[PDB]
């Protein structure tokens, strides 16, 4: 077989679906691994390090994809309308694997159907115990939870930890984490590392044990995700939190209802009650936002409060993000590779493949 991985020409994207470790493995399986001349300068992976593992270096995106039986990407390919017809570069008959963002981006899937490409959407992984290996949403959102705190620290004009000083005591920062999943838990862990006093809240009840284990305090207002509660709950979610939210210095917002847009936890009216120079990091900004003041791509200064809402947070940790994403891909691929008849035999029954597959 012959697998190919291109550079990401989507502006911002420094991530890649490859690493030198993953190149070794695919060769071991029986894949000629082709990569592009600089795919992963942002991920901080040199071409020669990929070649040491046993990968060819292509000149361009087209020469990489042209004879590619399998194609691994991070982002969905660009449609012709979007600028450059990347879907057309991929050989008709090839197997694509990336975060297609399928349910949103139907025009992309149309093109893949049009030229016989068997495309596999990684965001649509079933939430089953063994699938954590292959889940990109978790791997990337864990790194998004860490960096929430660093972006928070970067924008915050005070220091996080308590320091007893000759010139006096700087008090510890007060962090509040909204939503305690893969990202939310890391944010607690990371804020804790920097000496903050972390508190958190969630819809899910078993969360209280998770937060307390990291060393935070809990504030207490069906398949591995929060069911939407309604404004009955949203109203009760105001005043129970307000006590802490006022004196709170930094606010990470994680919450995501998988079907719907993101639930409004911090209103514009709540923002006003906080201290001046407080920071809010909105991670759900690309999906409506838990804070409706938050605008994608940019930091919104209003009410004496910074409101950060970067798009593509995992790319801001592109060098950690990328090898883990590549490992999610390999974990999905490995149980279907048939060496001895060195081919990719994607089982049509494995629940992994059922929820992943769309076109073929």
């Amino acid at each position: 077989m012959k697998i190919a991985i291109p550079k990401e020409r989507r502006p911002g994207e420094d991530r890649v679906a490859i690493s030198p470790e993953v190149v070794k493995k695919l060769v071991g399986l029986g894949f000629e691994v082709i990569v592009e001349q600089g795919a992963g300068v942002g991920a901080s992976i040199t071409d020669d390090a990929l070649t040491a593992a046993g990968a060819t270096i292509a000149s361009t995106a087209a020469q990489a994809l042209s004879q590619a039986d399998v194609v691994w990407k991070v982002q969905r390919p660009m449609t012709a309308e979007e600028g450059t017809d990347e879907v057309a570069l991929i050989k008709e008959g090839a197997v694509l694997m990336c975060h297609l963002g399928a349910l949103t981006n139907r025009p992309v899937v149309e093109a893949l159907t049009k030229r016989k490409i068997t495309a596999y959407a990684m965001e649509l992984m079933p939430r089953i115990s063994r699938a954590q290996s292959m889940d990109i949403l978790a791997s990337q959102s864990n790194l998004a939870g860490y960096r929430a705190v660093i972006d928070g620290a970067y924008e915050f004009a005070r220091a996080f930890p308590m320091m007893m000083t000759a010139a006096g005591t700087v008090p510890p920062a007060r962090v509040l984490v909204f939503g305690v999943g893969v990202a939310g838990l890391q944010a607690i862990a990371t804020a804790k590392r920097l000496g903050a006093v972390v508190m958190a809240t969630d819809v899910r009840a078993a969360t209280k044990e998770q937060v307390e284990s990291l060393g935070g305090k809990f504030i207490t207002v069906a398949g591995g995700y929060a069911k939407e509660m309604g404004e009955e709950f949203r109203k009760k979610q105001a005043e129970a939190v307000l006590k802490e939210l006022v004196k709170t210095d930094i606010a990470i917002t994680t919450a995501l209802i998988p079907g719907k847009p993101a639930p409004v936890l911090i209103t514009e009216e709540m923002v006003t009650k906080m201290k001046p120079g407080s920071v809010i990091i909105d991670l759900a900004v690309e999906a409506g936002g838990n804070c409706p003041l938050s605008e994608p791509g940019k930091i919104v200064v209003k009410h004496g409060v910074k409101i950060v809402g970067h798009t593509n947070v995992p790319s801001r940790v592109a060098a950690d993000a990328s090898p883990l994403f590549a490992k999610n891909l390999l974990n999905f691929l490995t149980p279907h590779v048939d060496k001895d008849t060195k081919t990719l035999v994607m089982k049509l029954e494995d629940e992994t493949v059922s929820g992943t597959c769309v076109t073929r």
């Binding site: 930890p161 308590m162 320091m163 007893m164 000759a166 006096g168």
Partner: protein
């Protein structure tokens, strides 16, 4: 002149106490004795003894020195107090556990201008009933001047390394 004591001696003193307060300093950090120090404070908390940490603002070799290491060892902020709101509480405390500290306890700060320690605020460890120092030797502190508490008081020189002698104490307490 000097009194001395073993980890068995420091166990007899602190386990039979109502209130001890801990005074961390550069030696704790040097010996990285911070996880043992929480553990000794955990044993005393389980026994029913009162425990608090007294952080002199200038203890260690940087600001926030004792804080970061006490935080590494997962001491909760609740029990940590600065000089300015603690050293009245020493007289209502049976044992003054001084670990790696020497300059910040020296009462010559509020006595004589023959010392360079003069003028600086200091933790009033002498106000406690008995004063447990832990340093390796008779050697000076950062200042290059000797504490009068060494030749004084109910002061005990628990001579040795701060991680190991705190560890040996914890074993003696069970």
């Amino acid at each position: 002149s000097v009194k001395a004591g073993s980890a068995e001696d420091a166990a007899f003193i602190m386990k039979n106490a109502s209130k001890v307060i801990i005074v961390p300093g550069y030696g704790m950090a040097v010996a990285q004795a911070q996880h043992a120090l929480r553990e000794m404070a955990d044993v005393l908390k389980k026994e029913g003894v009162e425990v608090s940490y007294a952080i002199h603002p200038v203890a260690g070799r940087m600001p926030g020195h004792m804080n970061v290491l006490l935080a590494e060892a997962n001491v909760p902020y609740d029990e940590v107090f600065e000089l300015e709101e603690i050293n009245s509480s020493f007289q209502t405390a049976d044992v003054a556990f001084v670990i790696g500290a020497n300059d910040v306890t020296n009462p010559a700060a509020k006595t004589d201008p023959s010392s360079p320690i003069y003028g600086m605020p200091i933790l009033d460890v002498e106000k406690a009933g008995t004063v447990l120092f832990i340093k390796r030797s008779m050697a000076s502190g950062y200042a290059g001047v000797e504490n009068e508490l060494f030749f004084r008081n109910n002061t005990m020189m628990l001579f040795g390394d701060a991680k190991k002698m705190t560890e040996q104490i914890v074993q003696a307490m069970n």
